[PDB]
Amino acid sequence: APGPRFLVTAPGIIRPGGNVTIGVELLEHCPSQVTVKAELLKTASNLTVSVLEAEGVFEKGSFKTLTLPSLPLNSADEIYELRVTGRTQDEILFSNSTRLSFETKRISVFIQTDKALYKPKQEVKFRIVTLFSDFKPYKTSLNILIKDPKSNLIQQWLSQQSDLGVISKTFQLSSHPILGDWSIQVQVNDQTYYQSFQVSEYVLPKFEVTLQTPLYCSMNSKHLNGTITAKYTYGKPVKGDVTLTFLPLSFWGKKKNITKTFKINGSANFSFNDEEMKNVMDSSSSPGPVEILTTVTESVTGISRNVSTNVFFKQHDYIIEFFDYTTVLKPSLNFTATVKVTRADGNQLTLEERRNNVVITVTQRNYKMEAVQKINYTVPQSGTFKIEFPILEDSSELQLKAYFLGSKSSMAVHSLFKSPSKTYIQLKTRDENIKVGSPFELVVSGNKRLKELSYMVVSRGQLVAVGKQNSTMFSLTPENSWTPKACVIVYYIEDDGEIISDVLKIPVQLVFKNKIKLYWSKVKAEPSEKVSLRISVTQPDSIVGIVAVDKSVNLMNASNDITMENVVHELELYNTGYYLGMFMNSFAVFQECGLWVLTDANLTGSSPHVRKHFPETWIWLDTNMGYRIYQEFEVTVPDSITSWVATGFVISEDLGLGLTTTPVELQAFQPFFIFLNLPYSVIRGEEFALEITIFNYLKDATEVKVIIEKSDKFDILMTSNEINATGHQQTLLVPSEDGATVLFPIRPTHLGEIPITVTALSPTASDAVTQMILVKAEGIEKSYSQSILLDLTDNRLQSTLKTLSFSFPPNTVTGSERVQITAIGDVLGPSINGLASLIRMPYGCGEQNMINFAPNIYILDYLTKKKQLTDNLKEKALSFMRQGYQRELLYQREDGSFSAFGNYDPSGSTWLSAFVLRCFLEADPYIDIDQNVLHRTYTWLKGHQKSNGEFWDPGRVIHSELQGGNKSPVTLTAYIVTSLLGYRKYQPNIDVQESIHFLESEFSRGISDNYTLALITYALSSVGSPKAKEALNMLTWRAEQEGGMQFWVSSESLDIEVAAYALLSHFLQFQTSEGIPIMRWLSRQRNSLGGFASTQDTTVALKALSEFAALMNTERTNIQVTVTGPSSPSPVKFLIDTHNRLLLQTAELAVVQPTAVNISANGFGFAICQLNVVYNVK
């Protein structure tokens, strides 16, 4: 019985925590019972170890799954092989294997902060939510790390435990923190996940602008219309002015723009006629998009808010758009498509235009004979209509062209399925919206009589369903693992053994089995009124996280909450990319979502309430329900006149994660209130005009007396009638449903936060508000920072005492002085995750071989000296060194010189041979380097030395940035001396004394250039010359120092070169404590771009960073730092061990003139203490 026997489909990817499910189908020509064993093998260091395995017995004519056990989540990117072996009772039947791609995303995490914009002296409250792939809660140990934009580790929590996946943590910011995008990192299992939140100086806006405009606009349209809605947070309309800039984005023309300035009361309509886009199509061939910018200024405060939208311009009045069409042509089957014909402005299509028929031209070409057919179709009321036309059997390319009233659309389908029997099937879906649990219908059509169909459903690179359907139409029920995109592959085998298949990719909308509903007790409430928030969940023993914030937090255009969009983005992150194969007849159709097939089937009169409490985050609740499905939490409404927006999430062990469908709003509003137009920061002594806006929303115009309370922290400039208080009260008239503004000149006289109490009294109502102004100090801000390294790596000494002093300038503004002291146990280095991307194959020419070779050596030396090198990366690294060493040894000539092309170039380069000697000398503890090659390079470099010691280059260097290091011969001598000066390991008799005398003479005449000076300093520090100290001192004199920063800026990569060379000069002269600002400059010049830029400064920078780590390579740290002195009445103690070695611990000291501290370190290791002084001058 010849024919097909088996068909085994296994996915080509593997993720940790996901079961590798394969599908086995046994056919008519196979025996009764076939035992299928699937093995997973890990290939490390040319050892293949069977990690996971499973076995099963399958019967003839049955389609079942063989499921492997789950991979552990601790695994990494190793070589994985899947081997499938199907056996009979006395003989094997198939035995094959493949490679598997690895995906690093194993679990889901959500970092929810209460807001994304934070003021200084605030508190960040956040939750870490750890879930599985099927959104069940995950219990694990993890680390939380909060860092500044300068990437110093400021806060950390080590080995926290998650109670049902939710971790609630808080973090108090400093008084003056580093402004910018702070980062929260979670190191769960072996993966780091990031979440950025901004810390800046901002004032919360009290209203929002929405701009309702059509997305498209026709050129033949007479008017472009739109609506502007400026609305307060508490729901009242905004009375103000609008400036409207209609600006074409044509870069060919000028900045011509229509401007329209008018008035707005809540909502306002605008329209532009053709005399307002007459400058627009003058400026624009095809027209580009235009920008409509709205600036609304509130007429009582002057606070302006601007929004912008983009409008695309279409040349025709109607747009004809297509969907629901197969991307692969199927011969002898009906092509179906759905057409939306809509107007440009988005309005409904009129009954007059419905009489015009859409002319659709089909063009089937055998790519060269073509068949062209024009069909007329009617248009419905909604404008969405389906077309269906047959396809001829020889058609290879289909061209569709639709015309309607001059509007044209066209596309072409070129992908043709080829079959020897010319038998094809088509799988189509009828439901536009597919959800989880709702069954959806599938229709299978074919040009011939169909056999028993077999369907396989694959989602997230995992085969999640199998089965056999005999009917040509069947219903399938999606599950939670099908999200977001599912492959339904429907196939059957003909009598000659040919597989006939179709693959349908469908988006599956995720529904949640767990539901959480939030209800306020009231829709509208007053401030300081007790309301109740009711939480209703689906299941008991659930943990509920509730956030309820100000609406202006949502109006800050930044949010870090857990919503449906983040869940959809994480589900799209679960989806992966796929690769290609050899495409026998349908294996591309199989591999459309990553499937690898094994088969043989192809062969042959009261005081007002004083409003003081103004928070931005009202409710930050983290509770456990226990036995309750609903709970009522009683809260007090704060004093902010706004709307409070509440959302939340629920986590249960049975159902998983659940989210609120809509945010629920509570309106905190009173009809008579006070608004203070305040900036964030005022300087002390400056007279600023406080703007008090009395908002009256009653039905009558009221005479309001505004009374500001006296304080000793500020002065009111204008006087009052009485002598008890100056500027005590003012009188004004506020209209009904409007606001009025009164100015008060205020001169603050004290630093810090100052309270202002404003009381508005009317015969109808009253209000009182107490608000904080942050008053800073006048003058110009200056910063000083001094760093001291305390070294305890030697076990002879145990206590080290150092002194740090600073004297203030005499023109310092009093009260502006701030003294901080930070202690760290280790420096911030390059991150290992990006540096693993910096290791590569040595390829190309010899200079390209060095470009792909040398940073691998210096990165391997750096993580060898930092003790963070994994074994697989190590074996890959030394494999790269061996192959790069062989590729560089291909380019060695007969005289020992090296070049880019080897023997093809006429003369070799001295600089490239020096680079060869330096890289091969560094690589010699790691790989085996032949000493005759190194001796030949010594003799060829020594043969190019003159009598004075000056060296000369007869060769050529192709690359610019390799030759960009200063072609003057003094740099050549210094580079060849610092490359030849590592050669003392083998023999120590190197006579470069004439060259050292030449470099000392070149230093003695006086150097203007700067890289050259750093190279002379490194050479003289390496030989231990007496002129090295003067050169390093004058190079430190040439350095720019600011903010604990020492660097060199060239007036014309080279800055990193001079910083690393002077750093190695400081290390070789035992001035380790002075290299710390340069080391911080090296730490800061690599944060935004991963590793180090280019290669030539990358090598020297990682050499200096590994040379620091080799000097302080003690893995045990137990350092106690005690800070005493006149500036500290209590001794400040920092404890540094191996866990908090990266923690930048900080402490604040009193202001004593002059500021002097004594820092005593006791223990073992090394520590760095930095004294920072911030002062304002006049």
Ligand SMILES: *[C@@H]1O[C@H](CO)[C@@H](O[C@@H]2O[C@H](CO)[C@@H](O)[C@H](O)[C@H]2NC(C)=O)[C@H](O)[C@H]1NC(C)=O
């Ligand atoms: C866009 O706004 C303009 C505002 O002028 C509208 O033009 C007016 O339309 C009404 C109703 O047809 C006429 O009675 C007026 O005489 C028109 N005013 C003019 C031309 O200045 C226009 O209809 C609006 N278009 C849309 C699509 O809403």
Ligand SMILES: *[C@@H]1O[C@H](CO)[C@@H](O[C@@H]2O[C@H](CO)[C@@H](O)[C@H](O)[C@H]2NC(C)=O)[C@H](O)[C@H]1NC(C)=O
């Ligand atoms: C719209 O165009 C006008 C010019 O027709 C711009 O007005 C000038 O703008 C510049 C830059 O702000 C000012 O320096 C001039 O004093 C303005 N003069 C006039 C005559 O208005 C206007 O700024 C444009 N609007 C936008 C937002 O692009």
Ligand SMILES: *[C@@H]1O[C@H](CO)[C@@H](O[C@@H]2O[C@H](CO)[C@@H](O)[C@H](O)[C@H]2NC(C)=O)[C@H](O)[C@H]1NC(C)=O
């Ligand atoms: C070598 O680097 C130093 C920086 O340390 C350069 O000196 C700076 O020159 C600029 C531009 O005129 C000044 O604004 C700085 O004040 C200087 N800083 C210091 C620390 O002196 C110097 O110019 C560089 N040399 C060359 C040849 O580029």
Ligand SMILES: *[C@@H]1O[C@H](CO)[C@@H](O[C@@H]2O[C@H](CO)[C@@H](O)[C@H](O)[C@H]2NC(C)=O)[C@H](O)[C@H]1NC(C)=O
């Ligand atoms: C801080 O360090 C200084 C310098 O070590 C200490 O200086 C003292 O100076 C007086 C001068 O008469 C000597 O008599 C002391 O013996 C010194 N003490 C030493 C050397 O430790 C100073 O006392 C230290 N104390 C504080 C808290 O500032």
Ligand SMILES: *[C@@H]1O[C@H](CO)[C@@H](O)[C@H](O)[C@H]1NC(C)=O
């Ligand atoms: C893997 O199989 C086990 C065994 O039943 C099951 O509990 C687990 O949920 C499966 N995991 C996935 C991701 O399907």
Ligand SMILES: *[C@@H]1O[C@H](CO)[C@@H](O)[C@H](O)[C@H]1NC(C)=O
């Ligand atoms: C299994 O491996 C062999 C050896 O390369 C190969 O010839 C064959 O095509 C593979 N597949 C099957 C189904 O035997």
Ligand SMILES: *[C@@H]1O[C@H](CO)[C@@H](O)[C@H](O)[C@H]1NC(C)=O
């Ligand atoms: C703006 O146009 C809409 C659409 O007809 C209309 O309902 C609304 O009243 C208009 N607003 C103003 C202020 O004219």
Ligand SMILES: *[C@@H]1O[C@H](CO)[C@@H](O)[C@H](O)[C@H]1NC(C)=O
């Ligand atoms: C609004 O205007 C200010 C001041 O020019 C500008 O800083 C801000 O970016 C603008 N915002 C928008 C959304 O255009």
Ligand SMILES: *[C@@H]1O[C@H](CO)[C@@H](O)[C@H](O)[C@H]1NC(C)=O
């Ligand atoms: C294609 O559509 C026409 C018109 O409804 C119908 O007669 C024909 O049977 C269809 N063919 C297939 C294969 O569905």
Ligand SMILES: *[C@@H]1O[C@H](CO)[C@@H](O)[C@H](O)[C@H]1NC(C)=O
């Ligand atoms: C479509 O309408 C045009 C114009 O009336 C006519 O010339 C053409 O023959 C029509 N085509 C069909 C298929 O009815």
Ligand SMILES: *[C@@H]1O[C@H](CO)[C@@H](O)[C@H](O)[C@H]1NC(C)=O
């Ligand atoms: C599938 O349906 C056909 C048509 O009725 C029938 O002949 C065949 O036996 C069915 N196969 C199975 C396995 O039910």
